[PDB]
Structure 1
Amino acid sequence: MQRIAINGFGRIGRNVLRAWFESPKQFHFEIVAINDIADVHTLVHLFKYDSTHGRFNGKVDITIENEKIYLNIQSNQRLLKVEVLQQKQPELLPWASLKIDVVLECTGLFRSHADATRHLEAGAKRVIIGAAPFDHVDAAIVYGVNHADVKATDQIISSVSCTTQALVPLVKIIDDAFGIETALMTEIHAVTADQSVLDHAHRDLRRARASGQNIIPTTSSALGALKRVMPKMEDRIDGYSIRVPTINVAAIDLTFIAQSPITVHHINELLIKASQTDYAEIMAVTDEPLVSSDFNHSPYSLIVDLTQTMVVGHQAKVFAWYDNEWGYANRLLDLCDSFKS
């Protein structure tokens, strides 16, 4: 069966594996290897215990065999024997011998086309960058929109940011119905590792500042991303992220100018249909009176709070929550399940 490997057992990598076991439907593929620069013990711990998502529900047993290290993981009536590796520089990795079909490059270090091929130079067949693009990419995918539009000879694939997978669907759907003259996105976002616990030295003089005590307006790769997905949107959309002191779950505030005429009802109605039809696998809509932590550990790439939708004249605004760790995790998985086809 298709063999997958994770480079970087960070938040993303860890949650991905967690998802594999937690996934309601067993993914046909299997993860057989994880690479990192840290000791296995540290990782296991972080995989086992998490402040956000909680104790991982199942045993994890390390075994040394020959000289190779292995995570025997069991959970949800499902096993994986993973091989651990401690190679800093990808190029030397043994993806060749392991017959690794798909690398999940989740280190955030090797985002470029050059640094991503290093995994292919190392004998892997297909890389997926678990972040926005840096320079070149053979395709910029958003499972639920253009996961089909992957050529087979594509090798360096990006699946963009968590933010981008809430934005792209909102935009596509609405442009396809009402038209979008120009849009503007505010993103209310939980904290991210990039920030500092206390005022520290940081390039981002904004993210320099105490994560827990500040509202921090900053930027989002998610615009430049979506412009690679919908190159026509170049010079029509913009926006930014705001960081506030919650641990997890984020929102989008999408203001836009419709080209056809719009009512509140109408916009909400469309988004409800869309969530039951084409985008059923990654969208959901809620009227109920909810707040971020209700959407924690929610595998949708976005949920629309419909009550939040507003309209004055041509101008409108919609609101979507999304677990900014866990949606984007199941989308790295859901995409890998699309390649067997």
Structure 2
Amino acid sequence: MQRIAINGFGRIGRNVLRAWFESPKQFHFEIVAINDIADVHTLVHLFKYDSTHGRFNGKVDITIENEKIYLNIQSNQRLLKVEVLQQKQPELLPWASLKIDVVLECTGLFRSHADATRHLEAGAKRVIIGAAPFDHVDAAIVYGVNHADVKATDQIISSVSCTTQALVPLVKIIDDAFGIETALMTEIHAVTADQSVLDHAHRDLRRARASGQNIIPTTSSALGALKRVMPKMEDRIDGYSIRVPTINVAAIDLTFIAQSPITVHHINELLIKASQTDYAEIMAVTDEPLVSSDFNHSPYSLIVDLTQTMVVGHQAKVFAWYDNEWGYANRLLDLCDSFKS
């Protein structure tokens, strides 16, 4: 019965903890610690009150022992006691004391294989970097696709990105059935926590601009990450992302060149079958006239909007929605649950 810790109690970290309590299936592992540079009182406040996902439907108590700070959290007839830490430098964390089996690295600041190793030094056995790899990882994993390819010897793992976890299924499903010559991705994405309120100095001159006022083209880490999960598609895939002023939920627009005959009907039927069989854990398809809000708090890795499917000659476009926060958080727990032996 494994022991998970979360480093970085932000949009992803907090949602991982909520999704644990809200899941209709109880997970076999326990989350037993969290860390963030903010104090516990700020953390509990933000865990309880969320502008995107609403009030946490449960009870949180804070316990100060002589040394340690704990949360006692109850919801949906489940209970966790969760040590809270406030240590900026992940090597100085007490992962050995706490017997931590997996650390979920959700800060965005420790994606290098070196930085992820800091958690290995502090005592943890295994790290899931919750982002695209910066350089080296023992594996890059998309739950529902290649999670069985985790070797019990692998110690630094990447759960890639929200975008990746939606792209890879699409690419795999379509490449297996029709063959993909090349494809280009357009992602339309809600604002993210690293953007700016008003125009302000920032590393990226596009993300420096007022996030509430602009359509903002930007890079996606998803293409680099898809190469690692499917090296057979090197040089065959590119794309980018566009930030717009919604609070949550994203869509992927994938345009590809088929290597065999295609119709709108054949593509949709294939995606329906995939969703009903081999991918039913992470994938759904709808034909209802829905918009982004309707997928807020959806646990799926992608939801294909089949009415958007288009074909001209050898070229086609498919479209899928996903909750970039709730889908990924759920896939993190699904991944941790897959290590059970």
TM band (smaller chain): over 0.9
* Cα distance in structure 2, aligned partners of 1:14 and 1:194: 16
* Cα distance in structure 1, aligned partners of 2:66 and 2:278: 49
* Cα distance in structure 2, aligned partners of 1:140 and 1:215: 31
* Segment of structure 1 superposing worse, 114-123 or 174-183: 114-123
* Cα distance in structure 1, aligned partners of 2:253 and 2:10: 28
CA shift, 1:36, in A, is 1.1
Residues 96-146 of structure 1: CA distance to partner in whole angstroms, max 9, x if unpaired?
A: 111000000111111111111111111111110011100110100000000
* Cα distance in structure 1, aligned partners of 2:2 and 2:168: 28
List structure 1 segments (4+ residues) > 6 angstroms apart after TM superposition. none
* Cα distance in structure 2, aligned partners of 1:326 and 1:98: 27
* Cα distance in structure 2, aligned partners of 1:310 and 1:109: 39
Corresponding residue SS for 2:26: coil
* Cα distance in structure 1, aligned partners of 2:243 and 2:82: 35
Corresponding residue SS for 1:45: helix
The TM-score normalised by the length of structure 2 is 0.99
Corresponding residue SS for 2:54: coil
Residue in 1 that maps onto 2:331: 331
* Cα distance in structure 2, aligned partners of 1:273 and 1:259: 20
Residue in 2 that maps onto 1:137: 137
* Cα distance in structure 1, aligned partners of 2:86 and 2:236: 44
Residue in 1 that maps onto 2:61: 61
* Cα distance in structure 2, aligned partners of 1:248 and 1:129: 22
* Cα distance in structure 2, aligned partners of 1:11 and 1:183: 30
* Cα distance in structure 1, aligned partners of 2:96 and 2:83: 14
Corresponding residue SS for 2:181: strand
Residues 192-242 of structure 1: CA distance to partner in whole angstroms, max 9, x if unpaired?
A: 112111111112111111101100011100000101111121111101001
* Cα distance in structure 2, aligned partners of 1:283 and 1:275: 5
The TM-score normalised by the length of structure 1 is 0.99
Residue in 2 that maps onto 1:178: 178
Is there any run of 5+ residues in structure 2 with no aligned partner, and where?
none
CA shift, 1:66, in A, is 2.8
* Cα distance in structure 1, aligned partners of 2:252 and 2:262: 20
Residues 266-293 of structure 1: CA distance to partner in whole angstroms, max 9, x if unpaired?
A: 0000000000111000000000000000
Corresponding residue SS for 2:182: strand
* Segment of structure 1 superposing worse, 57-66 or 149-158: 57-66
Corresponding residue SS for 1:157: strand
* Cα distance in structure 2, aligned partners of 1:251 and 1:183: 16
CA shift, 1:167, in A, is 0.2
Residue in 2 that maps onto 1:221: 221
Count how many residue pairs are aligned between Structure 1 and Structure 2. Answer: 341
* Cα distance in structure 2, aligned partners of 1:246 and 1:118: 35
Corresponding residue SS for 2:278: coil
Corresponding residue SS for 2:128: strand
* Cα distance in structure 2, aligned partners of 1:120 and 1:207: 33
Matched, 1:15 2:15: yes
Corresponding residue SS for 1:118: helix
* Cα distance in structure 1, aligned partners of 2:263 and 2:195: 39
Corresponding residue SS for 2:14: helix
* Cα distance in structure 2, aligned partners of 1:200 and 1:159: 31
CA shift, 1:161, in A, is 0.5
Aligned-residue identity in percent = 100
* Cα distance in structure 2, aligned partners of 1:8 and 1:210: 25
* Cα distance in structure 2, aligned partners of 1:64 and 1:206: 43
* Cα distance in structure 2, aligned partners of 1:128 and 1:74: 26
CA shift, 1:182, in A, is 0.4
* Cα distance in structure 2, aligned partners of 1:8 and 1:43: 10
Corresponding residue SS for 1:79: strand
Corresponding residue SS for 1:37: coil
Is there any run of 5+ residues in structure 1 with no aligned partner, and where?
none
CA shift, 1:50, in A, is 0.6
* Cα distance in structure 2, aligned partners of 1:233 and 1:198: 39
CA shift, 1:81, in A, is 0.5
* Cα distance in structure 2, aligned partners of 1:118 and 1:209: 34
* Segment of structure 1 superposing worse, 89-98 or 323-332: 89-98
